[PDB]
């Protein structure tokens, strides 16, 4: 209230309002879901158009051959953070000849976001990210929030009405966790999960976006006629 002028100010209850308002832009963002078995990890994203003449804003960005994310909130902020991540995955390759651990990718995003929450003149990032990757210790899903908090999960969802998908996944846990060595089934469980968050609309061909990465599948994106398979 008097304490939301900038990120360098604590409230008397110990809250950071600019960070919380940054968190709020995620909530207004279109829904996206992440989930994973032991062999693959999938991102499903609902894309949002401006009107019937416009394209549907991309929500999924590839970071490396073995890693990528989905976004909810300020798109340019995700571009910045995805670009940083591309650089970090790249540095790991060129210098160490090593694929960047998804867990380290999490730590690096956390520390980048945090610095903007403690310094004057900056602003927190206004986007939440879901990072999937397949690394030396299997399939992974990460949830990034611009508070800096990064969390490893079996599944989740973020954006508007993400709670529907999140409870579905919370129910479906023991089933989808064991969809090993079957790409199409894990994707279906993902599409089903996102559907719990739809209202007055359902999934169309140029509305839906899926990405998958796993044991012998490079991170790749499916849009358009290539998603028709799943509606």
């Amino acid at each position: 209230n008097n304490y939301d002028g900038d990120t360098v100010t604590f409230s008397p209850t110990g809250r950071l309002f600019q960070v919380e308002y940054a968190l709020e832009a995620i909530k207004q963002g279109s829904v996206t879901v992440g989930l994973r078995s032991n062999t693959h990890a999938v991102l499903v994203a609902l894309k949002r158009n401006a009107d019937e003449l416009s394209s549907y804003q991309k929500k999924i960005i590839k970071c490396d051959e073995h890693m990528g994310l989905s976004l909810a909130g300020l798109a340019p902020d995700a571009r910045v953070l995805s670009n940083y991540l591309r650089q970090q995955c790249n540095y790991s390759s060129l210098v160490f000849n090593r694929k960047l651990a998804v867990e380290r990718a999490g730590h690096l995003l956390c520390d980048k976001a945090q610095k903007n929450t403690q310094s004057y003149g900056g602003r927190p990032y206004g986007v939440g990210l879901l990072i999937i990757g397949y690394d030396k210790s299997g399939a992974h899903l990460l949830e990034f929030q611009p508070s800096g908090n990064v969390t490893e999960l079996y599944g989740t969802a973020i954006g508007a009405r993400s709670q529907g998908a999140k409870t579905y996944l919370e129910r479906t846990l023991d089933t989808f966790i064991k969809i090993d060595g079957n790409p199409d089934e894990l994707i279906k469980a993902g599409v089903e999960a996102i559907s719990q968050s739809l209202r007055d609309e359902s999934l169309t061909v140029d509305n839906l976006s899926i990405a998958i990465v796993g044991k012998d599948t490079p991170f790749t994106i499916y849009d358009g006629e290539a998603v028709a398979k799943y509606i």
Partner: protein, 243 residues
Amino acid sequence: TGYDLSNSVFSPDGRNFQVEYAVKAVENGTTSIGIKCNDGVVFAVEKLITSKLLVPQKNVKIQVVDRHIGCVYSGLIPDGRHLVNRGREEAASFKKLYKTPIPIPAFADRLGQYVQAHTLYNSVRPFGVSTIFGGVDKNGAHLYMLEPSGSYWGYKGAATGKGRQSAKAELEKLVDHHPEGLSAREAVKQAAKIIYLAHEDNKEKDFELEISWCSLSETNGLHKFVKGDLLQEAIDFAQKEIN
């Protein structure tokens, strides 16, 4: 007034209200503890299970600095990470120049001065964590707790977070009932108990326990996590004591 809107401003009573507000964010966090033992230290923390979807064992919060120092913190998690990253740079630098690994008291002041520096200007925000840390050096075992003001002291035992008072009470009993000393394996069990006991203040969600330790005899003076048989054994000891 308006003395509380800008960091590094003294109020008329002589206080920096922004630092005090940072403490509120600390008090809001999960409980974490440290117990000094005969030849070592033990760290433990409460990890709230927000959901079934959290992969168990896979959101680690205790952090190692160098090879001999353990750090755990309650409050804003990224702030704690920023502080440990700095601690790691400081330890690297000390090692680089002086060869020997950084003594724990020396390390404590490095965090102390850095945190304190964030109370000197209005262009930075104070740290939203209280940090319990320590380890084993050439002079024995040390446990420290450090607050947003940059204030720190050595401790026999220490706690912070929502369950700080429950844990403090429980720690005082140990200190009183073991004047001669507490062993590392003993301290690992007590730590587990005290976290389970301090979980009462936070009890909608059930939690995941996480312990670590450095002991001259039990870990060779290095920081190692407690898992497998030794963790479950300590979980069980705690399960027993709440019933």
